């Protein structure tokens, strides 16, 4: 009793329960997925529409960390916004110091260290969000990383974070992403997002899609409206049989 109140306290089993509770908070958020292909990374977010009074695009969970880096988040949105600000500052400082765009692995490591710095003391609270970082460059290719509230950062071929990530992982595993292109990966991501969404539990959602790759010339941006409509139509027709 009382071993789960501070991030500076270990449990007798050797666990930090505050970090686990932050991860639980992450597990309660909607699902965002990201798939790495041979020429880029595509992000898809199942953005729940909590109220019909909200404007379209409100509470967007896709961010432009840098010109070449995108961010898909899940969990507490204020914590995710603070972490996006941290990543933006890291990328800007790297460009100011070393004179070129930050590699995605280095940026992921820096942001993961910043997140881990909040799992050690009683004076602060662990972040209640997990996020993915995607980027593309000619020299480095397509890269996709995920950071959890504990500060662990790994590179992925296809990643899912949120309420339904095991089913999303099962759907992603059926994809031969190593040979696909962003054009097909966008439709596949839309189909997976429509598959894993719960119509009974959740009233409605918006499909937020973004990508970075050769088709975008190494820039992270929102997937164009035409491709988004085609992907949504394909996902709806695939849900139907």
């Amino acid at each position: 009793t009382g071993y789960d109140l501070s991030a500076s306290t270990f449990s007798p089993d050797g666990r930090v329960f505050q970090v686990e509770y932050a991860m639980k908070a992450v597990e309660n958020s909607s699902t965002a997925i990201g798939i790495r292909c041979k020429d880029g990374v595509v992000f898809g977010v199942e953005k729940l529409v909590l109220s019909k009074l909200y404007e379209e695009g409100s509470n967007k969970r896709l961010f432009n960390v840098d010109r070449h880096v995108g961010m898909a988040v899940a969990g507490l949105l204020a914590d995710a916004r603070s972490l996006a600000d941290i990543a933006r500052e890291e990328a800007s400082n790297f460009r100011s110091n070393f004179g070129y765009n930050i590699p995605l692995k280095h940026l992921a490591d820096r942001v993961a260290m910043y997140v881990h710095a909040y799992t050690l003391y009683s004076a602060v609270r662990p972040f209640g969000c997990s996020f993915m970082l995607g980027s593309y460059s000619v020299n480095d290719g397509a890269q996709l990383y995920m950071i959890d509230p504990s500060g662990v950062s790994y590179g992925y071929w296809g990643c899912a974070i949120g309420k339904a990530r095991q089913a999303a992982k099962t759907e992603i595993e059926k994809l031969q992403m190593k040979e696909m292109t962003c054009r097909d990966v966008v439709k596949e991501v839309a189909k997976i997002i429509y598959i894993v969404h719960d119509e009974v539990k959740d009233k409605a959602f918006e499909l937020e899609l973004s990508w970075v790759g050769e088709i975008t010339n190494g820039r992270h941006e929102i997937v164009p409206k035409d491709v988004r409509e085609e992907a949504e139509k394909y996902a709806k027709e695939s849900l139907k049989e």
Binding site: Y114, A117, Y118, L120, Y121, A123, V124
Partner: protein, 233 residues
């Protein structure tokens, strides 16, 4: 991330007037490995046991007997990393004294400064007291010194004393065997016998560490010399 520490004392008085954190640090010391110090007529011998839990350890990598200056040596009982911290601080204090006065620090002054540091950790905020007692030997003004500093920050001058496990039995053994006008070799023999009194298993030239201080200065005893002393015992 927040670099601030706790600003309140973790060691506080009890209704009986006792600082129980200091007593628990003393218990941690009493659970440590035996250490013996004997002040002879022409020097001081510091002895301790270092038996690793496995033969995979490197006996020649970590030393429990450490030099502070050319004329001061250290040995401890309790927690090793705390001893490392105190050794670093003692060396820094001795070097500061030499920088100021351009003469090597007397043993008493270094003991006082280290005890002041230990008291600071016993009273300051957000920290626990050190879990080590130190046996400090030195040679100053053509005279040997032996000191013991406890976790509370109090120090004592000793003719002979023991720390760690079975330190009461070691103290009684020293009372039986110690006498003034003792030569350094006899002091080393008595220290090794005091270690043997509580040593479990077989004592070799690697299971124990011996350091001596005399007019020539302080130095650790090499395993060959320890082997010679053990064969002579």
């Amino acid at each position: 991330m927040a670099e601030r520490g706790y600003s309140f004392s973790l060691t506080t008085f009890s209704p009986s007037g006792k600082l129980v954190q200091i007593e628990y640090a003393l218990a941690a010391v009493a659970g440590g490995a035996p250490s013996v110090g004997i002040k002879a007529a022409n020097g001081v011998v510091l002895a301790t046991e270092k038996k690793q839990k496995s033969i995979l350890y490197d006996e020649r990598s970590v030393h429990k007997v450490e030099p502070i200056t050319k004329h001061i040596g250290l040995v401890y009982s309790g927690m090793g990393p705390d001893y490392r911290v105190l050794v670093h601080r003692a060396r820094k204090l001795a070097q500061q004294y030499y920088l100021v006065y351009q003469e090597p620090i007397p043993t008493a002054q270094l003991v006082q400064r280290v005890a002041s540091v230990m008291q600071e950790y016993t009273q300051s905020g957000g920290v626990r007291p050190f879990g080590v007692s130190l046996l400090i030997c030195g040679w100053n003004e053509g005279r040997p010194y032996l000191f013991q500093s406890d976790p509370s920050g109090a120090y004592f001058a000793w003719k002979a004393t023991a720390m760690g496990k079975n330190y009461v039995n070691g103290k009684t053994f020293l009372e039986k065997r110690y006498n003034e006008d003792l030569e350094l070799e006899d002091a080393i023999h008595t220290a090794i016998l005091t270690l043997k009194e509580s040593f479990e298993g077989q004592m070799t030239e690697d299971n124990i560490e011996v350091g001596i201080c005399n007019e020539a200065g302080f130095r650790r005893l090499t395993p060959t010399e320890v082997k010679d002393y053990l064969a002579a015992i």
